[PDB]
Each structure stands twice: as C-alpha cells, then as structure tokens.
Ligand binder design. Sequence first.
Ligand code: 843
Length: 106
Amino acid sequence: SIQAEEWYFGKITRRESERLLLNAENPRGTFLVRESETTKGAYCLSVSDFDNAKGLNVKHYKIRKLDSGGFYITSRTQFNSLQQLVAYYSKHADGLCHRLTTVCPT
Ligand SMILES: CC(=O)N[C@@H](Cc1ccc(OP(=O)(O)O)cc1)C(=O)N[C@H]1CCCCN(Cc2ccc(-c3ccccc3)cc2)C1=O
C-alpha cells in the first residue's frame, strides 16, 4: 500500500509540497510523492534541490501508471510498483535533479 509509505503524502497541493520542501535544513534529494493536481491517476514526485545559481528550489516530476501495470517518469524506464520506482531513483539520478535521499519533514 502506497498510503502505507511514509513518503506518500497523498492529496496535498503543489504549493504545499513547495512550502514543505523549501526549508533550509533540507539537503538535496529531500522528497515526497503526492497525487497530481492536474492528471487523474497520475502522481507527482516533488524533489528539493540546491545549487549556487538557484539556491534552494523544488522540481516536480510526473509519475505515470499504466492500466497495464507499470509506473514511470520516462516510459523507457518502468517499475512494477511506486516503491520500486522510489528505490531505483534513490540510487540513480538519471534525469532527476538529484537522487532521492530522505523523506520531507512536515
Ligand atoms: C509545472 C511544472 O513544474 N511541471 C513539471 C512536471 C509536472 C510535475 C507535476 C505535475 O502535477 P501537478 O500539476 O500536481 O503539479 C505537473 C507537471 C516539470 O515541467 N518538471 C520538469 C522537471 C525538471 C526536468 C525538466 N522536465 C522534463 C523532464 C526531463 C527528463 C526527465 C527524466 C527523469 C528521470 C529519468 C529520465 C528522464 C524528467 C522530466 C520536467 O518535467
């Protein structure tokens, strides 16, 4: 159950995800997964980043789920579950702003 996952914040807004992530104590890769405001059946992986150009900032990645079963940000790299997706991106940055590190504090 994704609702069982501590990083799954459910039905929170994009502005709210940003408020929680834009905390000076959050290292790069601090994250949370929430429902998408705009796409039914889709989720959003919100991630904190930091660089000298932009300072502390947030990136949002749409996660799609096939009726066929797979979860993915890019269709070339799919997972059998949202949890396997989160585990993969915690080890590989690939196209993300940073690999996922720890769950966002509320
Ligand atoms: C308005 C906005 O912020 N849009 C997001 C996408 C997005 C995210 C959530 C969402 O619901 P909400 O309405 O609930 O918020 C709507 C749109 C976006 O555009 N992100 C960027 C993220 C940084 C990379 C650029 N990009 C394209 C891209 C390119 C490569 C990858 C990629 C990631 C991992 C592995 C391989 C490729 C991901 C995104 C985005 O989508």
